[PDB]
Structures are given as structure tokens and as C-alpha cells.
Amino acid sequence: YPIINFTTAGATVQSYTNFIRAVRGRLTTGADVRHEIPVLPNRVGLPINQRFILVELSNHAELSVTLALDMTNAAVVGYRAGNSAYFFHPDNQEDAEAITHLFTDVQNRYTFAFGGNYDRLEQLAGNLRENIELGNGPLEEAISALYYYSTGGTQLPTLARSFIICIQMISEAARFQYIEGEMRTRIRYNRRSAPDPSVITLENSWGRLSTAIQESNQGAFASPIQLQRRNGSKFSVYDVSILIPIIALMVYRCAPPPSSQF
């Protein structure tokens, strides 16, 4: 599986931008672009060889973890730390089989009894995303915490939190140039801060936004998607056009309709 390397140690907007673009690049098959927005490969019929990408994370503590990301949704499905691999509870038997092809050389393989969704992760962490700071510091700490879980030095809540940080700064950043931008700004000013309502609502609405765009009539949404701005004010999305600078990747939701060209 393709590997993308990133270190939080001395991370800059550029090195982070390079990292997200590389991840996004590996996530972009070029086979499916809907209104200038790449669509992630459909899960059905997707060969196991084309299923995962690896995100090797290093930090200032000289620790390394390797996150496995699912091509179909850019989601972290689990990670490797040393001779151990840890996987989120598979949502189905197909995914359960799929993950057996990840880190096949580790001595120890563990599947968490919990999934890698925010709701579960937030409950486990004892904190909502809103109250979990993001930035290079949080990610630096997330990597150490993920690594020390393999040596028994990390509690499950801190894990969870760490997963929440990693997912937003990697999976959501790849999915959204906007969220990438939010992370870039954090790094630019060494800012450590919880995601504002614009980041939260984009994350929550990623699937619905993907569906709305793919099911849109020439880009026009049949029904608006309610988002929030940075200040928390209601922002309604009626069209793909305003999402083009915002959403970088879509989860596959339907086949592109036969081109109805004028």
C-alpha cells in the first residue's frame, strides 16, 4: 500500500500542505470527478490492492505510528505502532476481511470493540470534537499517545481523543481544503484550538454533501444543506459551486448519471 510520511516535528504550513496534498493525491484515483470534485472509489468491487493508503506519522518525541486510511472514505481504519496493529471495529464482514491485508507483518493484531466514528470516539474520549483542541501540538501528542498504547502507556480516552485529532487533521483535511486550511492556519500561528462550528458541520455533513452534489441537478441541490460558519451562524448550501473550494473529496454515493449534455 502507498505510504505518505509526515512529521509534526518542525511542521510548517508547507510541510503539512505537502502532506495533505499527497494523502489527497493517493485518495484521488482520477476515475471519478463530479463537478471538479474527485469522488473516492466505490467500495463495491474495489480490489483489496486498491483499498488502503498508509500515513506514517512521526513526531518530535521521535515516535512513529502508521495510520491506515480507507480509499473509499479517507477514514482511519486503524494504525500500526512498532510490532502491533490496532483496528477500529469493522462496520461489516467485507471491511473485517479487508483490514487483514493491513500490516500483515506485525506480531500483534488487535481489533477494537468500538468503531472509528466521532460519536463513539467522543464518548470514549469523554469530550466532543468541539472541546478537543486541534493543531500541530495536539497531533504531536496524538502520535505519542497512539504509539504508547502499544506499550500500555495510553488510556482509552486519550487514545480516542488522539484518534479524533488524527482523523480531523488527516482524514477531514484531505476531504476538505477548508479543514486543511483551518489546520494550516493553526500551524502557521502555532495555534492549538478546538474546531469551530464550520469545521464541525462540514465533518458532520460530509456524507450528505457528497450525496447532495452527486445527486444534484447540474450542481443544484434538491434540498439545501445547513452548515455553520466559523462564528456559528447558519450557512445554507444550495449548490456544489460554493463547495468547490471547500470539499476536496467525496465519498461515492451514486453512479454519475449519463451525461445530459445540451
Residue numbers in the entry: 6 to 267
Provide text from the study.
The RiVax immunogen is a double mutant of RTA that combines the Y80A mutation to inactivate catalysis with the V76M mutation to ensure the removal of any trace VLS activity from the immunogen. Here, the crystal structure of RiVax was solved to 2.1 Å resolution and it was shown that it is superposable with that of the ricin toxin A-chain from Ricinus communis with a root-mean-square deviation of 0.6 Å over 258 Cα atoms. The X-ray crystal structure can be superposed onto that of RTA with a root-mean-square deviation (r.m.s.d.) of 0.6 Å over 258 Cα atoms, demonstrating that the Y80A and V76M mutations found in RiVax do not significantly perturb the overall protein fold or alter the conformation of residues corresponding to known neutralizing epitopes. Neither the active-site mutation (Y80A) nor the VLS mutation (V76M) significantly alters the side-chain conformations of adjacent residues. The enzymatic activity of RTA is the primary source of toxicity and therefore must be attenuated for safe vaccine development; this can be achieved by the introduction of a single point mutation, Y80A. Disruption of the VLP by a V76M mutation was shown to prevent RTA-induced weight loss, a biological marker of VLS, in specific animal models. The HTH contains a type I reverse turn between Phe181 and Ile184 which connects the two antiparallel helices of RiVax. In contrast to RiVax or RTA, the crystal structure of the RTA 1–33/44–198 R48C/T77C immunogen reveals that truncation of the C-terminus converts the HTH into a helical segment. Examination of the GD-12 epitope in the X-­ray crystal structures suggests that unlike UNIVAX 70/138, the binding site for GD-12 is partially buried in the folded protein. The results demonstrate the composition of the RiVax clinical material and will guide ongoing protein-engineering strategies to develop improved immunogens.
